[PDB]
């Protein structure tokens, strides 16, 4: 259930110099008030995260998935409902489909034959609906099905004054897809500039998929085009690096430094 | 109701744990006649992709499930290899599946004229004609209908009564971890030195009580020596202690 | 549907021959039949029973004595005896199982009577 | 093994009168139990299937019933052309066994 | 032996370990389930050989 919409007024994505984001809990271990050093896959410090904006204007091309990614969204309406992962996405390579619908999340691992415009918007002018459920053409040789508790939801739609930020980190090692989630409320910065704050990333779940992955895609939610407002999201890519961590007395990370950035570092 | 002899019920039990203790308290004493694996070691020695067949035959053919014994049903409805692994569980159904007027829903096929290969289901709807004569009909001379009907009258003696039997067979097809779950739970915090295992952390020490606060995603505790000192019990959600001997 | 006797003759102990029951159209390879034993003035006895799958069943008194052959298309069943200690002074009947659960066949067959003794025909 | 014996060994006094032949089994038997009707030196001819079924053309005065390790058979027409011997046989219980002998004669 | 060689035996019902280098002849029927069997060839009363 897809149509070739096209006619998208795309722009090159902007770049925002990241300050502190790109850190997560490496394990499930209780250490209190001990400075601990480690090396693993993370987001390097002071690398510019790619800022995408969607207004009218819509854009969601295929993007590379190298050593896991870090996705963030600054919103208060929760337009993005799911994502698409895989390599070919044309009924040749086994692919992921993790979408949050109604009040649950569903994960579907199968041979997926998608369409040129994976869209869920497009029923009327502005009344939002999950139109075109079948983004894939047919159910091919399938692998895995999963249903669980949903993520955070935003009531109705809010355009402007985005007070919520959702940050997720995606990775896969040894065929294990680790997905971690975090949410920060009350963002009062109307004109860009990131935040310049520190927020540790709590783990969410790990899934043993055991399949290859090279690219990824995102999903958002009369018959052509929509009257939609402002939406903004961030995409960054990982690298094997090394950091320090300062656990507090309770077990929460409160400070972190890098080793391969500055001679002072 | 279980499926009949000609088409046994198919149920491929997979993706679970190992627990077969529900058979002992289900019913009074009944027949087990286990041959391959010892009956006391079913909880351990896990396998993969158990091949379960459920069907009801009278008591005459219950003991004919052993490999190497042929007959009328054991030769022409269900054939077993001599290196068979696993065993069956059989019990009477004198009050549940036995009709006072005689249950005739159960049917079996005896005319196949072919020795069965192990572990398959064959359907023979056609009628066999004898004497090299074209029958092309039902209920005629020298033509025999393979299907025949059971009778489950409760006034019958032992051997003619219905007997529910489920065939359980265990095979290692490269042994993936599909159905393998122990239990081994023992709650004993006696403040004495013990070889403890909590969620696979082998160690020896004296287990006492503490009050450390752990985050839900934060299970193990370490120290300066990078050794496990404070742990959390898997069945419950209590942080035990940092206490060696 | 009829059956044809084949056999007979008087032999000393230690000698045996081939007894045969011939069919009149019925296939004798992949079917279920049996042979039974009868003596004058005494009850019936059961020699052997053969199925389509090769299942041979017989009494323990005639253990390792009788071997049975089924023709592919000659419509005749053969039996060779072994270890004759002069207890086969009887007649054999070649027959079919009367009923499994519901049947109305009533055809049967004949056969020869054999006597075994140290004295031959006089 | 089924050991079976019958009390009416020689029914030589029956001339068209009530006959109460029977067979008893050592163990409990189902409905499946039949009889062979053979002349002296002749192959048997079937008359009863599964203790309740009858042939195509036979006299209909024959009756029988079997339950609880015992079958009873009664005949009232003693026609002269059916002078033979009646034997019992049980199946579906390996090994197969056969009767010891019943005599019926009309004067 | 093609005709059947049953002269070689083995034990599989002991519920007890062994030290090195001993033989044990336990002809008695092993009981499992903590219920006195006091019989022969019964349910949960298996021959050890
Ligand atoms: C395993 O889970 C079961 C429930 O699925 C537990 O049974 C009850 O659990 C509640 C909540 O934890 C307790 O308040 C009850 O006291 C439990 N009842 C019993 C009889 O145990 C069960 O306790 C759990 N296992 C363990 C070891 O805690
Ligand atoms: C959809 O439109 C794009 C844009 O030109 C084009 O490249 C593609 O071939 C079209 N696909 C179909 C199925 O029309
Ligand atoms: C963003 O990063 C890319 C490569 O990492 C670089 O080419 C580009 O100049 C950067 N832009 C800004 C504004 O830092
Ligand atoms: C959400 O999706 C799942 C499966 O994808 C479905 O079972 C559930 O009904 C959906 N919720 C709706 C349609 O409200
Ligand atoms: C295709 O299906 C078969 C089962 O028919 C399965 O074993 C195989 O893994 C599947 N291939 C995939 C998921 O790539
Ligand atoms: C640990 O948490 C408690 C309450 O959650 C707080 O009062 C305390 O200040 C925290 N410890 C530190 C070192 O901040």
- Domain holding C50: CATH number? 2.60.40.10
Cα–Cα nearest to A8, from A39, A40, A53, A73: A53
Record the tokens describing residue A75, joined without a space: 């919103």
Residues of chain B positioned with their CB less than 8 A from the CB of C51: 70, 75
Instruction: Give residue C59's domain range.
Output: 4-114
Contacts of E2 by beta carbon, 8 Å cutoff, 6+ apart = none
The answer to whether the CB of A116 is under 6 A from ligand 2 is: yes
The 3-class SS string of chain B reads CCCCCCCCEEEEECCECCCCHHHCCCCCCCECCCCCCCHHHCCCCCEEEEEEEEEEEECCCCHHHCCCCCCCCCCCCCCCCCCCCEEEEEEECCCCCCCCCCCCCCEEECCCCCCCCCCCCCCCCCCEECCCCCCCCCCCCCEECCEEECCCCCCCCCCCCEEEEEEEEEECCCCCCCECCCCCCCCCCCCCEEEEEECCEEEEEECCCCCCCCCCCCCEECCCCCCCCEEECCCCCCEEEECCC
Residue pair D32/D50 in contact (Cβ under 8 Å)? The answer is: yes
Of all ligands present, the nearest one to the C-alpha of A145 is 4
What is the C-alpha end-to-end distance of chain E, expressed in Å? 20
> For residue C120, is it within any domain?
no
Nearest CA to ligand 6 atom 13: A249
Give the Cα separation of A68 and A52 in Å (integer). Answer: 18
> For residue C24, is it within any domain?
yes
Distance from CA of D41 to the nearest CA of C (A): 8
Distance from CA of E43 to the nearest CA of B (A): 7
* Contact yes or no for D68 and B157 at CB 8 A: yes
Residue pair A236/A69 in contact (Cβ under 8 Å)? The answer is: yes
Chains in contact with chain D (at least 3 beta-carbon pairs closer than 8 A): B, C
Helix (H) or strand (E) holding A170: strand A164-173
Quick check: D83 contacting B, CB < 8 Å? no
> For residue C119, is it within any domain?
no
Last residue before each break in chain B (C–N > 2.5 Å): none
Q: What is the CATH number of domain A14-265?
A: 2.60.120.960
Residues of chain E positioned with their CB less than 8 A from the CB of B38: 12-13
CA distances from residue A20 to A257, B12, B131 in whole angstroms, order as listed: 9, 52, 92
Record the tokens describing residue E1, joined without a space: 């032996």
Structure-solving method: cryo-EM
- Domain holding D47: CATH number? 2.60.40.10
Tokens 């690096």 identify what position? A241
Using DSSP, state whether A15 is helix, strand or coil: strand
Chain centre to alpha carbon of residue D85? 9
Of all ligands present, the nearest one to the C-alpha of A81 is 4
- φ, ψ for residue D82, nearest 5 deg: -105, 35
* Contact yes or no for D30 and B71 at CB 8 A: no
- Resolution in Å, one decimal, please: 3.6
Give the Cα separation of A22 and A62 in Å (integer). Answer: 22
Number of domains composing chain C: 1
* Contact yes or no for C53 and B70 at CB 8 A: yes
* Contact yes or no for B113 and C30 at CB 8 A: yes
Residues of chain C positioned with their CB less than 8 A from the CB of B70: 51, 53, 55
Number of domains composing chain D: 1
The answer to whether the CB of A133 is under 6 A from ligand 3 is: no
Q: How many angstroms does the Cα of residue A251 sit away from the middle of ligand 6?
A: 10
Give the Cα separation of C44 and D100 in Å (integer). Answer: 7
* Contact yes or no for B217 and A25 at CB 8 A: yes
Residue B222: closest C-alpha in chain A: A31
Question: How many residues would you count in chain A?
Answer: 265
The neighbouring-strand residues paired with D65 are D72
Record the tokens describing residue B198, joined without a space: 């909590």
> For residue C80, is it within any domain?
yes
| Cα four-point dihedral sign B216, B217, B220, B226 | negative
Residue B31: closest C-alpha in chain E: E43
Record the tokens describing residue A237, joined without a space: 């890519």
Give the Cα separation of D36 and D24 in Å (integer). Answer: 16
The answer to whether the CB of A91 is under 6 A from ligand 5 is: no
Instruction: Give residue D52's domain range.
Output: 4-104
């Amino acid at each position: 259930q897809c149509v070739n919409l096209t006619t998208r007024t795309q722009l090159p994505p902007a770049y925002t110099n990241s300050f502190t984001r790109g850190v997560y809990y490496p394990d499930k271990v209780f250490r209190s008030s001990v400075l601990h050093s480690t090396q693993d896959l993370f987001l390097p410090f002071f690398s510019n995260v790619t800022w995408f904006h969607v207004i009218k204007r819509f854009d969601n091309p295929v993007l590379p998935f190298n050593d896991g990614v870090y996705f963030a969204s600054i919103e208060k309406s929760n337009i993005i409902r799911g994502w698409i992962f895989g390599t070919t996405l044309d009924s040749k390579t086994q692919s992921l489909l993790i979408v949050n619908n109604a009040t649950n999340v569903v994960i579907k691992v199968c041979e997926f034959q998608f369409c040129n415009d994976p869209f869920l918007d497009h029923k009327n002018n502005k009344s939002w609906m999950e139109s075109e459920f079948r983004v894939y053409s047919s159910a091919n040789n399938c692998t895995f099905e999963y249903v669980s508790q949903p993520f955070l939801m935003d009531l109705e739609g809010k355009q402007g004054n985005f007070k919520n930020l959702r940050e997720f980190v995606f990775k896969n090692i040894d065929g294990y897809f680790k997905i971690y989630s975090k949410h920060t409320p009350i963002i009062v910065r109307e004109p860009e500039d990131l935040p310049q704050g520190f927020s540790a990333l709590e783990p969410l779940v790990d899934l043993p998929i055991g399949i290859n992955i090279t690219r990824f895609q995102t999903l958002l939610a009369s018959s052509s085009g929509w009257t939609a407002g402002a939406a903004a999201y961030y995409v960054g890519y990982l690298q094997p690096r090394t950091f320090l961590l300062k656990y507090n007395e309770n077990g929460t990370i409160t400070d972190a430094v890098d080793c391969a950035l500055d001679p002072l570092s | 109701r279980f499926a009949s002899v000609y088409a046994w019920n198919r149920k491929r039990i997979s993706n679970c744990v190992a627990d077969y203790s529900v058979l002992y308290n289900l019913a009074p004493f009944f027949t087990f006649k286990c041959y391959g694996v010892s009956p006391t070691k079913l909880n351990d020695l896990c396998f993969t992709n158990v091949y379960a067949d459920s069907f009801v035959i009278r008591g005459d053919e219950v003991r004919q499930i052993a490999p190497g014994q042929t007959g009328n049903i054991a030769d022409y409805n269900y054939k077993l290899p001599d290196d068979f692994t696993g065993c069956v569980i059989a019990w009477n159904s004198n009050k549940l599946d036995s009709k006072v007027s005689g249950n005739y829903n159960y049917l079996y096929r005896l005319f196949r004229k072919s020795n069965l290969k192990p572990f398959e289901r064959d359907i023979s709807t056609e009628i066999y004609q004898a004497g090299n004569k074209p029958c092309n009909g039902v209920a005629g001379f020298n033509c025999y209908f393979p299907l025949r009907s059971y009778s489950f009258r409760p006034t019958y003696g032992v051997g003619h009564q219905p007997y529910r039997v489920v065939v359980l067979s265990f095979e290692l097809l490269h042994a993936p971890a599909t159905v393998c779950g122990p239990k081994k739970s023992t709650n004993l915090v006696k403040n004495k030195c013990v070889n403890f295992n909590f969620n696979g952390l082998k160690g020896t020490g004296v287990l006492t009580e503490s009050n450390k606060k752990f985050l839900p995603f934060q299970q193990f505790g370490r120290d300066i020596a990078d050794t496990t000192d404070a742990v959390r019990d898997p069945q419950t959600l209590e942080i035990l202690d940092i206490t060696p001997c | 549907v009829q059956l044809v006797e084949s056999g007979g003759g008087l032999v000393q102990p230690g000698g045996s021959l081939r007894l045969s029951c011939a069919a009149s159209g019925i296939i004798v390879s992949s079917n279920y039949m049996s042979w039974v034993r009868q003596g004058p003035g005494k009850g019936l006895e059961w020699v052997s029973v053969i199925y389509s799958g090769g299942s041979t069943y017989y009494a323990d008194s005639v253990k390792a004595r009788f071997t049975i052959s089924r023709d592919n298309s000659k419509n005749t069943l053969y039996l060779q005896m072994n270890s004759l200690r002069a207890e086969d002074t009887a007649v054999y009947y070649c027959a079919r199982e009367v009923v499994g659960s519901n049947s109305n066949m009533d055809v049967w067959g004949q056969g020869t009577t054999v006597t075994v003794s140290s004295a031959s025909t006089k | 093994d089924i050991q079976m014996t019958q009390s009416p060994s020689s029914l030589s006094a029956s001339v068209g009168d009530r006959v109460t032949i029977t067979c008893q089994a050592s163990q409990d038997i189902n409905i499946y139990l039949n009889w062979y009707q053979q002349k002296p030196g002749k192959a048997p001819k079937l008359l009863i299937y599964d203790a309740s079924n009858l042939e195509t053309g036979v006299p209909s005065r024959f009756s029988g019933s079997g339950s609880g390790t015992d079958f009873t058979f009664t005949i009232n027409s003693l026609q002269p052309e059916d002078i033979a011997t009646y034997y019992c046989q049980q199946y579906d219980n390996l090994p197969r066994t056969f009767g010891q002998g019943t005599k019926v004669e009309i004067k």
